[PDB]
Scaffold this active site. Sequence first.
Site: not given
Ligand SMILES: Cc1cccc(C)c1OCC(=O)N[C@@H](Cc1ccccc1)[C@@H](O)C[C@H](CC(C)C)NC(=O)c1cccc(N)c1
Length: 331
Positions: A36, A216
């Site tokens: 990620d 991302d």
């Molecule tokens: C799968 C999907 C579909 C559509 C839209 C989104 C946003 C998405 O993805 C959802 C998602 O949660 N993706 C995250 C990774 C993830 C993927 C799958 C399951 C869990 C987490 C990361 O790629 C991005 C995320 C959001 C940012 C860009 C605003 N970062 C944090 O929450 C984060 C960052 C730094 C520190 C901490 N503690 C947390």
Amino acid sequence: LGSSNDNIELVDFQNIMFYGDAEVGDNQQPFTFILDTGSANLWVPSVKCTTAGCLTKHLYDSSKSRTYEKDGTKVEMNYVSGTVSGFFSKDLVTVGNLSLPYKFIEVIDTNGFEPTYTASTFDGILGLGWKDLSIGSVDPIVVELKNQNKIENALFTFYLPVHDKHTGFLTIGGIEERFYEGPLTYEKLNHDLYWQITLDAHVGNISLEKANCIVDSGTSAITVPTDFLNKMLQNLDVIKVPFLPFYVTLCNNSKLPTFEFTSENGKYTLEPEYYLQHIEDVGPGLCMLNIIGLDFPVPTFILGDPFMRKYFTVFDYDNHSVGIALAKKNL
Ligand SMILES: Cc1cccc(C)c1OCC(=O)N[C@@H](Cc1ccccc1)[C@@H](O)C[C@H](CC(C)C)NC(=O)c1cccc(N)c1
């Protein structure tokens, strides 16, 4: 450096998601991860995890690793997608053919991530963003490998798998020409947090100047600010299923616009063939748009998987920039 590089194969899942493998412990216990660029911590479910999501997963048992070094600091990891919790641990992490001592999160509670985790084939998540994006102020894996001379450059690149077509590869250490065609254009990180750069976004006649664009690998859709999306859907023959974030359209809707993101260095576009899922669906050709409206303090587009599938991308910690080139259709 005549090539070198640590290549980790990426495994595709229906052109929706992709995964990669890494190991923890001097005994190299195996786990499947979401690699990620949008987070900065590595976590794996512990042998001490009793929740339901943990039942189908590969679990880390630190008692089987001589290199394990106890930490114990409690961590609650909150993604926009859910929450996992546990504690910090230190042990050997093997990525591709390289190993390094590393601080990761041993997760014992995934209730805050269910039913998602229960219905996931990945074991954990491996963050590839900047140090400041992490909980714990953990230096990025790639920055480390560089510090220890295990790699040529503090950069990694993503060649995403394309379903039915070919595999992907997360390449650490250097840039391989086998993955891209045409020029490789660099866009300066606007900040050392996320791999975020400034591009003017344009669709049709709507334009959003100097939009913050987060590259991302961990986002499976292209996200758009809602007011921007609202203006572009006007008369497009695109239907929103209320309540649920889904937008559907006939796969052949001639009105479908091309996203255009531009800097003074390059112009990146995402045509309908790249953001349209389904194709020959429920009825005629009902297609789902792999786009969702999402609002941040400043207008942001998350350039997720659909963008990266088309574009080879380079992440350079040394030069604080993201390089972008047309990905080669096949290996
Ligand atoms: C799968 C999907 C579909 C559509 C839209 C989104 C946003 C998405 O993805 C959802 C998602 O949660 N993706 C995250 C990774 C993830 C993927 C799958 C399951 C869990 C987490 C990361 O790629 C991005 C995320 C959001 C940012 C860009 C605003 N970062 C944090 O929450 C984060 C960052 C730094 C520190 C901490 N503690 C947390």
